[PDB]
């Protein structure tokens, strides 16, 4: 795909989700656990 | 005009692609102006995106990334304002929109009459299957078009040849979908943008993106302000300067400035200041109400201490109360903006090295009576079973809402009771309380006593069952009324019958019994003046305030009052064997025993 | 630009036609903006009017009447603003400019650059030698051209057409002297005025004259504010409204509005309010000074007795203090605008049935501490020899000036002394005191000491000779310093060499002599606490205010001070009246610190 | 000339000066005495 495992300085980047590292933009993003939203998955989703 | 708030996910997503598409529908379906970003990410190769065609203006950035669909149906988007940029650099960013192993991806951008970007860069890159994107003359759309400044246009091969009816710069492969130049074709005498190559084709200075005609009433987007169908630099004010008299004189057509618009009156949650509607008054002035209108004027030498909330003032960058910013609230009675508690605030943040809050620091909020925004609690220390640290809160102001909500609690397992005591008003927005699996007394509350209008609603779901809480004896004091209660205490019910003594509800008052004596009315009881002698064995002592309204005093009687010594101060007086004062000859200040000077000591 | 004030004489004139001409040179020579009316009346046919070529803007109306001269050289006049109108109707009135038994009068108008008249009508009537003005089309020049406005030209034998290149509409016989149309020839796409018939030839909307291009900085004249070369409806204020945060935020480009211009600083005598520089504030606000800047804030339950002067507020229509308006000043302490005393105000005005002021009525001004404008005295009751009715006046503001003057006293023969006491500052403008042939304290005053800038001057052309005043003994009290004196009394001196007891100057103070006692301060002496012993032979017993400052008193001496009686914690006192604490359990009496010392 | 004797209602129109009436415009014109100026000659002249 377009991403790999997060570099060590990002170990705790995402909260209540799984971190992924976008190689072409050198930028982390996260896939959130059920019911969570926001850039680091740190907020609860009201639409759930 | 239909307005929607947008998102702040950047490149993050939900755990399922079907939930990610449904969310995109819920945020952006049936709206035309976005009060934030447009973020379209991870959408599959075969989805209906035709709902995005109603978007005409975006306040923040437009991000299109990691998708697989063939056509981007942004068919009415004219202007991007760029008030927030992707990575603080780009107003439009389109990248990586293809499947790596397969043959799906974005082929045509759409973007029918996109004509203006008012701020930031433009980034179009890594989009494997786009045909026309690299032929577009983006410097006509972008202000400060200087190509060395964040204008990073890339990205494909085997396509990009224009239809014979469009002289290069095509959006698509047909007679339509041709880029129209609005700035680079104008006369050297021209201000802003034009609708043709001549000076007579130039449009008014406060229009953006081009025009139907030359007028401020006849164009495709305003910039600065929309004065009721005309684009303007500012709106007419309450006073004007008269250059011949050297004084300020009252205007006849004044309007209050409000967002990008101008109005005849400010909404009831905004403060009027200097011919504008503002969310908060500056700390140098007191907010007051005059003739039902909120406004502000300079305060007296001692005045209320108000803190910045989360997302405003000195805390503009904060997401939550945490161990670093919580010390700012020590003597505040009012908070301007929001009060928010996220998991990063309560339990710390190991990525940014922010420490968890010591549960004892949260007692710092016991002085606050008003919050002007919303209350948002998503995390709370496990050993704090109630909200007694907020017991003195009176009003939730609701001047700003979190997705329409003003009181919001989710997923608190370590709670049994709420225990608010002073809370009487929730002025705007909805109440949302869910997933509180150990919370009991919530089910008793009469929420129409806290709501300020019939248009307010509450959502309750998946909390502890009321039938299980009743079975366990989770009930309030026997005096508590049908309005319900915050917690088990005799002072934690919304309203009660019989009488109360401050916050505590009581069965009876000290009229003829106990250590002191008082009088009662309207479920309230307060002490009469301590000069009144306490009556015993069921006899009533007091039936009103003061040294008046009682059976008798232990002091010397003097009209409606009593005194420690009858001749004190004073005309002059002496007292009889029942301690009632009667006239004496004047002077005699050493003491008197009767009506005349012969009775003086 | 060179700015001058205009006259307001209408058709009235001086008795001598040479003085009429010399007066006209002195008001209008070497200035380009006339801050009032331009009025040219009764000028002889042999006079030089070339000094009028400097005039470009008139803020009021232009009046040209009853004159003998052939040509009116206003070729570069551009705009008439119409702030006031002649007979309340006309911004330009030209009439009767000929002699009917002879052959002299006005022939050719000049006026080539006249482009905009912002308010009022146009009135050209009953001239004899003026032939070309019938051809001119005023509706291009007049801002309100419709038939409901009084725009009219009334007759001569004629003077042909000016040149073959001029299609009528012309002032004199050349291709140089025909009218530039600026409104009636403009394309229907354009609002305001144009510099040619095409849309590409239109001016910027916020301009009044002709233009070199469609820009706010490239037009000849405008009807609004001048923001550093740009003509604009409003200029940048102290705060700008942020449309995404919904708050007012500070503006680093802010400018103050001042008259018709946008400026960075407001002059020291003006008060700043709401991003503008103004003469006075609303009755709901008080003037305060913070960081050396005067500004206004909402006033509390007690507000200053702000009062309307002559020419402002409820008295804007008034020319003088008089018997119909003098009652409005009875409880006034700060006057906004001027106090002006003319012949009609003092001696009456039978034309309007207004009676003379009864001299006693002038005492309503005894309470005035500040005048924000100017003081102008040209008449006073013959029964008064001084101005002591103003003795409490402290400051003359000078926010408005009378031809540059802020204090003006003309032709008062009854006055022998001025007798001000409280006047310490004249914040702006010059002083002009003349023809007071009986006044003897004008030359002893150190007038530079009342000024608040090096640019202020005093003019004294003639009063009573200093040698005659000296011969009569018209000098101030011996205690008075070199700064001079308002009148003969020791209290009317500007500043005294020895100490003053309030307003009264004295040789020596009651430090150690007399029935009351005082302490020294830097130029004054002030009484001590009455408990303190009145010792002889140089023994001053106090060093400032209060019963704590006394070295020895006839009353009780407690810890911090002398008192008439000590408290009942309860205190007792020794045979020297020195007070000490009693046992706590005392109410009726005590003679010592312990329980057996307490008395009942 | 252009001037006539002032009508009775203008008797006290001029102060320190002589009244004339401008017939064509039915309006007074006041001629001021030594050192006086103004529409009714009511003010003293600062130049003389
Ligand atoms: C690309 O750019 C174009 C402009 O080049 C944008 O066009 C806008 O499209 C909307 C419709 O989606 C237009 O709104 C409609 O305009 C009609 C215009 O009618 C004539 O009269 C005007 C008079 O000024 C002329 O300018 C015009 O050329 C026409 O000759 C109206 O008739 C419509 O109103 C009627 O229909 C509705 C139906 O619900 C009724 O409610 C009304 O009562 C009425 O009967 C309507 O107003 C809009 O005017 C266009 N704007 C511009 C700037 O021209 C596109 O949005 C943009 N994108 C795409 C996908 O094309
Ligand atoms: C300056 O500010 C003014 C407001 O002060 C803005 O006005 C908006 O004008 C646009 C059109 O240019 C409006 O949008 C469309 O209006 C159609 C007509 O209905 C409106 O008008 C009637 C009265 O004439 C009202 O009764 C009615 O409530 C509407 O307000 C509608 O048919 C359109 O809606 C349809 O399409 C959308 C998708 O595009 C669907 O979501 C709808 O369900 C529906 O099918 C649409 O509403 C707009 O409403 C006006 N706003 C306001 C507040 O009046 C100017 O646009 C603005 N100018 C600039 C340059 O910014
Ligand atoms: C939140 O707001 C509260 C007030 O509502 C602030 O609390 C006050 O803080 C001040 C700080 O100066 C305290 O003043 C100091 O108090 C000391 C203790 O006084 C108490 O105990 C004595 C015991 O005899 C009592 O007499 C007295 O009434 C108090 O109950 C004094 O020892 C201090 O005196 C010393 O300092 C002063 C400085 O000027 C010197 O003049 C003295 O000579 C001496 O050296 C001083 O008086 C005050 O007591 C506090 N009040 C309360 C109610 O607790 C918080 O600080 C504020 N928080 C924040 C973060 O802003
Ligand atoms: C002992 O306990 C008794 C109650 O048992 C208390 O009595 C109250 O006394 C106050 C005055 O101190 C009363 O208030 C005044 O009432 C006047 C009469 O009007 C009322 O009564 C008539 C009866 O027919 C009704 O029709 C009418 O609607 C009212 O209810 C008013 O005239 C007074 O207001 C006017 O005068 C004041 C003057 O300052 C102005 O400020 C006002 O603007 C207004 O013009 C005033 O309202 C009160 O009514 C008494 N209550 C009862 C229940 O009788 C005693 O006060 C208490 N002892 C002590 C020491 O406080
Ligand atoms: C009636 O109205 C017209 C139009 O407003 C006035 O026209 C002005 O004419 C004067 C004299 O020519 C101009 O003043 C001079 O401008 C020079 C700059 O060039 C101008 O002309 C070119 C085209 O030829 C334009 O491109 C350019 O923008 C300018 O407009 C300056 O260099 C001159 O300064 C020098 O001379 C003066 C003389 O006093 C010295 O003090 C200086 O130190 C310096 O050496 C001078 O400023 C003026 O600019 C014209 N205005 C306009 C807007 O065109 C008429 O003057 C007026 N009628 C009468 C009778 O005055
Ligand atoms: C907005 O406000 C500005 C000023 O705040 C106005 O511009 C001023 O206009 C006046 C009148 O033209 C200028 O006054 C002249 O000062 C000259 C000084 O020389 C300098 O400035 C001129 C600019 O005109 C330059 O050409 C020159 O190189 C110098 O830098 C004097 O020499 C002038 O005296 C001569 O001309 C006058 C014309 O009035 C004749 O009557 C005299 O006889 C003499 O020959 C003259 O006094 C002033 O300097 C300008 N200030 C500047 C430069 O900003 C704008 O006009 C105003 N905008 C509007 C129209 O609203
Ligand atoms: C008879 O009464 C007179 C007064 O009429 C007494 O005189 C005292 O004189 C001394 C000087 O000799 C005064 O002390 C000085 O006062 C200055 C002003 O302080 C006031 O104003 C400021 C304004 O912001 C306030 O902040 C402040 O609280 C006061 O209200 C101070 O600036 C001086 O401080 C400097 O000097 C001292 C010297 O020890 C240093 O310690 C300081 O760091 C600083 O450098 C100084 O305090 C005093 O105020 C006068 N007192 C009175 C009552 O006014 C006589 O003493 C009195 N005689 C008898 C017999 O009692
Ligand atoms: C929650 O609190 C609300 C607000 O106090 C209570 O609503 C009140 O309901 C009563 C009973 O229905 C209403 O009184 C009745 O009104 C009708 C009006 O036609 C009248 O005919 C009856 O005689 C009687 O007066 C009352 O108006 C209403 N108040 C409001 C503001 O709507 C409600 O009872 C509370 N619920 C509980 C169970 O605590
Ligand atoms: C006996 O009843 C009286 C009322 O009759 C109770 O006291 C008074 O209650 C009224 C409201 O019913 C209070 O009026 C309000 O005061 C606030 C002051 O900020 C004002 O904002 C409101 O607009 C309104 O005027 C009144 O203050 C109050 N008086 C006192 C002294 O508390 C009383 O509590 C009852 N019980 C007993 C035993 O006294
Ligand atoms: C009249 O009032 C003026 C203005 O207040 C007084 O003028 C002042 O004269 C003093 C004389 O001492 C000047 O102070 C200094 O004098 C010394 C002399 O050695 C010199 O070295 C210093 O440079 C300084 O000038 C003071 O500056 C000056 N003030 C002004 C505004 O010029 C004048 O004394 C008063 N009385 C009389 C009798 O004129
Ligand atoms: C001894 O004489 C000096 C003057 O040489 C006196 O000084 C004056 O003190 C007064 C005190 O009120 C100062 O007044 C000021 O008024 C403003 C009003 O807004 C207030 O904000 C200030 O805090 C201040 O009180 C005045 O400026 C000052 N004058 C000078 C020239 O310094 C002093 O009072 C005399 N002492 C005795 C014991 O009489
Ligand atoms: C001040 O007013 C008084 C009147 O109050 C004038 O005194 C009068 O002078 C006339 C002169 O012919 C005498 O006949 C009167 O008897 C005087 N009256 C009194 C009451 O003495 C006095 O002349 C006035 N002074 C000035 C300068 O006008
Ligand atoms: C209610 O109690 C029953 C036992 O009486 C239990 O089975 C059930 O799980 C309880 N429900 C909740 C919500 O605790
Ligand atoms: C000065 O006094 C003399 C008499 O000593 C007198 O003749 C002369 O007129 C006086 N001058 C003035 C100015 O009054």
PDB file of N, CA and C and ligand atoms in Angstrom, chain B residues 543-549 560-561, ligand 4:
ATOM      1  N   UNK B 543     -42.959  35.730  64.268  1.00  0.00           N
ATOM      2  CA  UNK B 543     -43.804  35.637  63.068  1.00  0.00           C
ATOM      3  C   UNK B 543     -43.433  36.684  61.996  1.00  0.00           C
ATOM      4  N   UNK B 544     -42.178  37.130  62.000  1.00  0.00           N
ATOM      5  CA  UNK B 544     -41.625  38.109  61.066  1.00  0.00           C
ATOM      6  C   UNK B 544     -40.194  38.512  61.442  1.00  0.00           C
ATOM      7  N   UNK B 545     -39.522  39.306  60.594  1.00  0.00           N
ATOM      8  CA  UNK B 545     -38.145  39.738  60.811  1.00  0.00           C
ATOM      9  C   UNK B 545     -38.026  40.856  61.865  1.00  0.00           C
ATOM     10  N   UNK B 546     -36.782  41.114  62.280  1.00  0.00           N
ATOM     11  CA  UNK B 546     -36.385  42.217  63.162  1.00  0.00           C
ATOM     12  C   UNK B 546     -36.667  41.984  64.657  1.00  0.00           C
ATOM     13  N   UNK B 547     -36.437  43.014  65.499  1.00  0.00           N
ATOM     14  CA  UNK B 547     -36.850  43.046  66.911  1.00  0.00           C
ATOM     15  C   UNK B 547     -38.375  43.167  67.067  1.00  0.00           C
ATOM     16  N   UNK B 548     -39.050  43.492  65.967  1.00  0.00           N
ATOM     17  CA  UNK B 548     -40.500  43.461  65.817  1.00  0.00           C
ATOM     18  C   UNK B 548     -40.994  42.009  65.607  1.00  0.00           C
ATOM     19  N   UNK B 549     -42.306  41.817  65.471  1.00  0.00           N
ATOM     20  CA  UNK B 549     -42.921  40.536  65.107  1.00  0.00           C
ATOM     21  C   UNK B 549     -42.632  39.359  66.052  1.00  0.00           C
ATOM     22  N   UNK B 560     -40.842  49.852  68.048  1.00  0.00           N
ATOM     23  CA  UNK B 560     -40.681  48.566  67.367  1.00  0.00           C
ATOM     24  C   UNK B 560     -39.357  47.861  67.720  1.00  0.00           C
ATOM     25  N   UNK B 561     -38.423  48.555  68.372  1.00  0.00           N
ATOM     26  CA  UNK B 561     -37.095  48.062  68.731  1.00  0.00           C
ATOM     27  C   UNK B 561     -36.997  47.728  70.228  1.00  0.00           C
TER      28      UNK B 561
HETATM   29  C1  LIG E   4     -42.929  42.687  60.810  1.00  0.00           C
HETATM   30  O1  LIG E   4     -43.534  41.808  59.877  1.00  0.00           O
HETATM   31  C2  LIG E   4     -44.401  42.486  58.950  1.00  0.00           C
HETATM   32  C3  LIG E   4     -45.131  41.412  58.179  1.00  0.00           C
HETATM   33  O2  LIG E   4     -45.880  40.574  59.054  1.00  0.00           O
HETATM   34  C4  LIG E   4     -43.581  43.404  58.051  1.00  0.00           C
HETATM   35  O3  LIG E   4     -44.514  44.224  57.347  1.00  0.00           O
HETATM   36  C5  LIG E   4     -44.158  44.824  56.068  1.00  0.00           C
HETATM   37  O4  LIG E   4     -43.870  46.206  56.206  1.00  0.00           O
HETATM   38  C6  LIG E   4     -43.420  46.814  54.981  1.00  0.00           C
HETATM   39  C7  LIG E   4     -42.946  48.204  55.333  1.00  0.00           C
HETATM   40  O5  LIG E   4     -41.883  48.155  56.280  1.00  0.00           O
HETATM   41  C8  LIG E   4     -44.566  46.807  53.977  1.00  0.00           C
HETATM   42  O6  LIG E   4     -44.117  47.341  52.731  1.00  0.00           O
HETATM   43  C9  LIG E   4     -44.794  48.569  52.355  1.00  0.00           C
HETATM   44  O7  LIG E   4     -46.229  48.355  52.171  1.00  0.00           O
HETATM   45  C10 LIG E   4     -46.973  49.587  51.851  1.00  0.00           C
HETATM   46  C11 LIG E   4     -48.467  49.244  51.831  1.00  0.00           C
HETATM   47  O8  LIG E   4     -48.809  48.481  50.617  1.00  0.00           O
HETATM   48  C12 LIG E   4     -48.880  47.030  50.814  1.00  0.00           C
HETATM   49  O9  LIG E   4     -50.042  46.681  51.650  1.00  0.00           O
HETATM   50  C13 LIG E   4     -51.380  46.941  51.070  1.00  0.00           C
HETATM   51  C14 LIG E   4     -52.420  46.459  52.095  1.00  0.00           C
HETATM   52  O10 LIG E   4     -53.750  46.757  51.629  1.00  0.00           O
HETATM   53  C15 LIG E   4     -51.506  46.250  49.697  1.00  0.00           C
HETATM   54  O11 LIG E   4     -52.727  46.678  49.039  1.00  0.00           O
HETATM   55  C16 LIG E   4     -50.332  46.630  48.783  1.00  0.00           C
HETATM   56  O12 LIG E   4     -50.421  45.886  47.540  1.00  0.00           O
HETATM   57  C17 LIG E   4     -48.975  46.343  49.437  1.00  0.00           C
HETATM   58  O13 LIG E   4     -48.824  44.907  49.583  1.00  0.00           O
HETATM   59  C18 LIG E   4     -46.435  50.205  50.545  1.00  0.00           C
HETATM   60  O14 LIG E   4     -47.048  51.511  50.414  1.00  0.00           O
HETATM   61  C19 LIG E   4     -44.892  50.363  50.565  1.00  0.00           C
HETATM   62  O15 LIG E   4     -44.316  50.671  49.222  1.00  0.00           O
HETATM   63  C20 LIG E   4     -44.395  52.066  48.782  1.00  0.00           C
HETATM   64  O16 LIG E   4     -43.685  52.946  49.722  1.00  0.00           O
HETATM   65  C21 LIG E   4     -42.205  52.827  49.764  1.00  0.00           C
HETATM   66  C22 LIG E   4     -41.683  53.872  50.764  1.00  0.00           C
HETATM   67  O17 LIG E   4     -40.254  53.749  50.908  1.00  0.00           O
HETATM   68  C23 LIG E   4     -41.617  52.997  48.349  1.00  0.00           C
HETATM   69  O18 LIG E   4     -40.209  52.659  48.364  1.00  0.00           O
HETATM   70  C24 LIG E   4     -42.301  52.061  47.341  1.00  0.00           C
HETATM   71  O19 LIG E   4     -41.820  52.340  46.000  1.00  0.00           O
HETATM   72  C25 LIG E   4     -43.827  52.204  47.355  1.00  0.00           C
HETATM   73  O20 LIG E   4     -44.182  53.501  46.811  1.00  0.00           O
HETATM   74  C26 LIG E   4     -44.199  49.079  51.033  1.00  0.00           C
HETATM   75  O21 LIG E   4     -44.348  48.071  50.003  1.00  0.00           O
HETATM   76  C27 LIG E   4     -45.042  45.375  53.776  1.00  0.00           C
HETATM   77  O22 LIG E   4     -46.209  45.342  52.966  1.00  0.00           O
HETATM   78  C28 LIG E   4     -45.344  44.697  55.110  1.00  0.00           C
HETATM   79  N1  LIG E   4     -45.720  43.319  54.880  1.00  0.00           N
HETATM   80  C29 LIG E   4     -46.845  42.757  55.327  1.00  0.00           C
HETATM   81  C30 LIG E   4     -47.031  41.313  54.977  1.00  0.00           C
HETATM   82  O23 LIG E   4     -47.674  43.378  55.985  1.00  0.00           O
HETATM   83  C31 LIG E   4     -42.621  44.249  58.885  1.00  0.00           C
HETATM   84  O24 LIG E   4     -41.675  44.894  58.044  1.00  0.00           O
HETATM   85  C32 LIG E   4     -41.899  43.407  59.942  1.00  0.00           C
HETATM   86  N2  LIG E   4     -41.017  44.158  60.813  1.00  0.00           N
HETATM   87  C33 LIG E   4     -39.846  44.698  60.467  1.00  0.00           C
HETATM   88  C34 LIG E   4     -39.082  45.357  61.574  1.00  0.00           C
HETATM   89  O25 LIG E   4     -39.407  44.647  59.323  1.00  0.00           O
END
